[PDB]
Amino acid sequence: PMKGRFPIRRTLQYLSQGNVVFKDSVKVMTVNYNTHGELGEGARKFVFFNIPQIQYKNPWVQIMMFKNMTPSPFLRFYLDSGEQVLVDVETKSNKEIMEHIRKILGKNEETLREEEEEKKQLSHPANFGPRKYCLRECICEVEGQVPCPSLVPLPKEMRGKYKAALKA
Amino acid sequence: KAYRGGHLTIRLALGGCTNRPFYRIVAAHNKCPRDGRFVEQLGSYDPLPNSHGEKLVALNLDRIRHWIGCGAHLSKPMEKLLGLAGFFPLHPMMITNAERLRRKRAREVLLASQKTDAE
Amino acid sequence: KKVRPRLIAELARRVRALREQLNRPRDSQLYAVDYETLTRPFSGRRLPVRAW
Amino acid sequence: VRSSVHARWIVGKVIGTKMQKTAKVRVTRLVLDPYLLKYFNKRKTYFAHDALQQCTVGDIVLLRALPVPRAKHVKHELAEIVFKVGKVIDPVTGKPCAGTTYLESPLSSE
Amino acid sequence: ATLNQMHRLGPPKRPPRKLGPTEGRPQLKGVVLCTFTRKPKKPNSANRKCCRVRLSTGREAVCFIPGEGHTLQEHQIVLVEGGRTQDLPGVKLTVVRGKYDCGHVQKK
Amino acid sequence: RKTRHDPLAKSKIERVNMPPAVDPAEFFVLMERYQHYRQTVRALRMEFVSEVQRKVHEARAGVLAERKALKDAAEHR
Amino acid sequence: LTQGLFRGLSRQETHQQLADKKGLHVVEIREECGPLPIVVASPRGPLRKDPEPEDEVPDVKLDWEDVKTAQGMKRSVWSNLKRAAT
RNA sequence: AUAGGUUUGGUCCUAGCCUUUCUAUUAGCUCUUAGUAAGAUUACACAUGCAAGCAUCCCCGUUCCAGUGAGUUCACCCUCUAAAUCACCACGAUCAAAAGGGACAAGCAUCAAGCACGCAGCAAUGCAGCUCAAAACGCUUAGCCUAGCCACACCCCCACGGGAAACAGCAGUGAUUAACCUUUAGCAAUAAACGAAAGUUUAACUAAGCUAUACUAACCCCAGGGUUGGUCAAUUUCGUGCCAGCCACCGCGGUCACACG
RNA sequence: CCCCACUAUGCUUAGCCCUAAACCUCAACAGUUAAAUCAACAAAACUGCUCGCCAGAACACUACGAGCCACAGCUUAAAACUCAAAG
Numbered sequence A: 001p002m003k004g005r006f007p008i009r010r011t012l013q014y015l016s017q018g019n020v021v022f023k024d025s026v027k028v029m030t031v032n033y034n035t036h037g038e039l040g041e042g043a044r045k046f047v048f049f050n051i052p053q054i055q056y057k058n059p060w061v062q063i064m065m066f067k068n069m070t071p072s073p074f075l076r077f078y079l080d081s082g083e084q085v086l087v088d089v090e091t092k093s094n095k096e097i098m099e100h101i102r103k104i105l106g107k108n109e110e111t112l113r114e115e116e117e118e119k120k121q122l123s124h125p126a127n128f129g130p131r132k133y134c135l136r137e138c139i140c141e142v143e144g145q146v147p148c149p150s151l152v153p154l155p156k157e158m159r160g161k162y163k164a165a166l167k168a
Numbered sequence B: 001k002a003y004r005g006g007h008l009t010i011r012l013a014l015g016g017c018t019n020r021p022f023y024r025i026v027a028a029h030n031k032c033p034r035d036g037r038f039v040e041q042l043g044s045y046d047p048l049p050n051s052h053g054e055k056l057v058a059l060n061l062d063r064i065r066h067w068i069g070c071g072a073h074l075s076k077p078m079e080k081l082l083g084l085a086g087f088f089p090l091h092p093m094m095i096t097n098a099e100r101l102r103r104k105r106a107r108e109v110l111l112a113s114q115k116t117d118a119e
Numbered sequence C: 001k002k003v004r005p006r007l008i009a010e011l012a013r014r015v016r017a018l019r020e021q022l023n024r025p026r027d028s029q030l031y032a033v034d035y036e037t038l039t040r041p042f043s044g045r046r047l048p049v050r051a052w
Numbered sequence D: 001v002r003s004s005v006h007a008r009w010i011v012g013k014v015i016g017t018k019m020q021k022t023a024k025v026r027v028t029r030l031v032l033d034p035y036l037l038k039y040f041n042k043r044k045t046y047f048a049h050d051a052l053q054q055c056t057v058g059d060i061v062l063l064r065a066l067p068v069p070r071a072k073h074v075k076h077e078l079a080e081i082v083f084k085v086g087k088v089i090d091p092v093t094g095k096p097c098a099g100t101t102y103l104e105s106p107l108s109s110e
Numbered sequence E: 001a002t003l004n005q006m007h008r009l010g011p012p013k014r015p016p017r018k019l020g021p022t023e024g025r026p027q028l029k030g031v032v033l034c035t036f037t038r039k040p041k042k043p044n045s046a047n048r049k050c051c052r053v054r055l056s057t058g059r060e061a062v063c064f065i066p067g068e069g070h071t072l073q074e075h076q077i078v079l080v081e082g083g084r085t086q087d088l089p090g091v092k093l094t095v096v097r098g099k100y101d102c103g104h105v106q107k108k
Numbered sequence F: 001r002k003t004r005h006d007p008l009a010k011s012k013i014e015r016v017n018m019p020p021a022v023d024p025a026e027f028f029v030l031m032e033r034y035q036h037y038r039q040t041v042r043a044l045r046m047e048f049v050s051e052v053q054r055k056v057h058e059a060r061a062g063v064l065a066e067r068k069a070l071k072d073a074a075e076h077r
Numbered sequence G: 001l002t003q004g005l006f007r008g009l010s011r012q013e014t015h016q017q018l019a020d021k022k023g024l025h026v027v028e029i030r031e032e033c034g035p036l037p038i039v040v041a042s043p044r045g046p047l048r049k050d051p052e053p054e055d056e057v058p059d060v061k062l063d064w065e066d067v068k069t070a071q072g073m074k075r076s077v078w079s080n081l082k083r084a085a086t
Numbered sequence H: 001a002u003a004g005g006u007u008u009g010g011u012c013c014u015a016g017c018c019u020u021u022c023u024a025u026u027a028g029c030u031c032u033u034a035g036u037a038a039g040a041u042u043a044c045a046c047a048u049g050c051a052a053g054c055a056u057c058c059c060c061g062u063u064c065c066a067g068u069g070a071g072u073u074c075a076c077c078c079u080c081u082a083a084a085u086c087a088c089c090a091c092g093a094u095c096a097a098a099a100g101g102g103a104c105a106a107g108c109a110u111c112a113a114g115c116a117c118g119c120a121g122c123a124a125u126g127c128a129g130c131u132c133a134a135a136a137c138g139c140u141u142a143g144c145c146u147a148g149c150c151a152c153a154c155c156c157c158c159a160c161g162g163g164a165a166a167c168a169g170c171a172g173u174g175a176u177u178a179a180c181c182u183u184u185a186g187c188a189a190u191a192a193a194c195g196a197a198a199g200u201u202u203a204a205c206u207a208a209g210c211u212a213u214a215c216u217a218a219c220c221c222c223a224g225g226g227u228u229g230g231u232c233a234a235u236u237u238c239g240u241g242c243c244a245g246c247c248a249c250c251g252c253g254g255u256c257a258c259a260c261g
Numbered sequence I: 001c002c003c004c005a006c007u008a009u010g011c012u013u014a015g016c017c018c019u020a021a022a023c024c025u026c027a028a029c030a031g032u033u034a035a036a037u038c039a040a041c042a043a044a045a046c047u048g049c050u051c052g053c054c055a056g057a058a059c060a061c062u063a064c065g066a067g068c069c070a071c072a073g074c075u076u077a078a079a080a081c082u083c084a085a086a087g
Ligand code: FES
Pocket: A138, A139, A140, A141, A147, A148, A149, A150, B016, B017, B020
């Protein structure tokens, strides 16, 4: 089997389930949690399950964790303008934390669909080229048009071998 | 790549196999190869008539108007495709080449007539 | 990532530019013409037939 | 406002302070292992400009990219000391703390 | 192992594939030097026609002539190929029949 | 193709390309057609150039764009 | 191989035993039939009124061979070969 | 991998090797037609011919296309900002070099230390640091992440200078290698250069020639190659007698050879 | 191999050498006895976490290189040829 406890965390299907896509302002995210204490239980589960999901969606965001530096856990974000966003996460579950930072610093569903829609316009169906970029390579793949000579030989009147011979 | 000088141009990039040509309209640098790297593909042109006897020509007018406004030039064959469509005026030589054909065919009607008349 | 300097490429560049300014040809040499063969002796190039 | 430096804001830890008005900071980022699909810390060293030389080895600091590198390796500057070594102040309560214990009870100031 | 140990090491490094007597080439051209016979190892017993040739690379190895009878002499040209001679130990090359001086085995 | 350093062929040494003959009528009529065609196209090009300048300025400095940048900053506070 | 094949094929839990075990409906979801829920088995005894507690993350041991295939990483020139009817 | 053969007197386990599949090159035997695609082994040396001209003189162009893979983390993103295009002033856009930041191949740690690789300061000048087992420095190998890109352009990284007299442009030749395309035609199409333009030029390209290397299709006449102990589809009769010979693995052959001919 | 005799050595002191079947051939911390207990033998079968180590046999407790009060030494440690087994 797959090593480690909860091996599903190390899967692309689980890393892409994160719904926290930070904005352009967020630059650094610092997590301070305590290894023990009933109050900090959620913060530990948030570092064990969701940090992988957050860093996968925000690869250009620095995430640094510190253990047992304060009596209580908390999150702190550092924006590009110089503003700091403190977030007390004591006495909260990992879902409440994941849902709370999505409302104050995460993008909404309206801002995401737009970005995706732009990409669809990058691949024009009318264009012809390699299969990697375009759907069709040549226009002989379109019924009605003249087929490729490799498959269907052209008439002797349409080949430059005989056009020259017929003329001379 | 960086070319000394040069400019963008909207030309035709030949494609297809032997005796089966297929041009694809593209905006590419002036010095780049004919079928090499391009900035954007702005249409396609199938010279050979289809079953219906018609030549197909695709044009991304919204993008052709963008590159012409960014400093792009046009090739003579491509300026004759935009004149046949009504996007540009009929190229001067598309008109003069038609007049030359008229006089040429009228010059052949004389010899044909004389032969049938004289002989 | 530290590119190794090419000093001879800069030395010759300066020398060439200098010589192009000290040995530059004059308008008497460049734009001369032999009125029998109609060629510029500097380059040995014929003029267009419409200028003869 | 726009600068020629890639990393604008980064958090690190002072590892050395043996250069004049300069602090050597170690920055860690999580990097995904493509095969194991697990994140590991990839660290990197950054040179920060400290005018007052108030940094101490072992403290967390915040760096701000400079408009242009003042030196060959110095591209950032000390914005603020997040956690001072041994004298951290709880941001939630504003009270001193030594680890997971309060040095000054938060109830003193209600 | 552990995930941390598997990350430090990295993807398995496949040992560099070793080259054979032909040095990763289908065939090779060589000149004949000698024509002797060698006895195979147990459980077999025979006299197998072999020849020492100098390849174009510069080496000088031993080769096995397949077929019944041959007319190979010194200084002749032959084309060799791969293929272990199972009975003969240390013989990794085989002569190609009907190429250059080497002539196709006469019928019967 | 050749370079500046490559020499010339010996078959093109004594070569003279004579210009084509001119039809006075067609030459003049065709010389005006290019004059108009190129003037009609110079105007079209200027039109399209003004549309590319507009959109860019509109995008970074527009009414709608600046009406949304303030909404996103107000919602942040 | 044979002694183990018969061993696992005899210790497999059917849909009826599962329902009776947990007192819940066993619903079948098929892509060809859309979102239609198909009841394949129901408990004979008292149907439970409380649902199963939804689990955020399941602690089930996975197989790298299956996960490596679902991610387009198991390259093999011997898998998915055209063979005769069986 | 749906796996299979092979350790032993025999069994189980472990393990390596090999077989079965799909491509490419060369060799042997053999080979009917048509269309299409592709097409030196060698950065070794090259006979001949051609490959850049245009144009009322100036300028522009020959810095492109084409070619090769010697060398090799200059190829990507951001910032800033020249040249160039948008007739022109300006505008901003487009495109994009230099500079600054970041990212970026493989193998060897029996390459473990590198030896000036740092910082401050207007300057003078001062401090003594910088990189590295989370792999510095170093050796070796390799064109790459392919709508294409990078690098090279006889050699000395460069090219004033020197050696010295150059096909890694097309066709072609010598040497070399297991490796082998014609010393065709035309600028009619497209592209590029020049011209105000009609137009001119182009071994780019287009249309042909050669080659079972591959794909497609077909043919009244026209089929060979390998294999036949097991894995693995398929042998009758003679000859040979551990000799001659065969095998991808296990092995056959000692006068009854389904394994050699 | 058996008997007798005797020496280095076994002991003390001051230094060096740094090896072993240095093997209880069974790593450290925490935890479990239920499920499929479990190839065989041996000292029943497993979980979590971490470090170290091994990837066919032989060549090889070898060669070269480097380091070490070690100079017939120790540590680190390959390759070519060979086999279809070894275990
Ligand atoms: S591919 Fe379209 S003609 Fe051959």
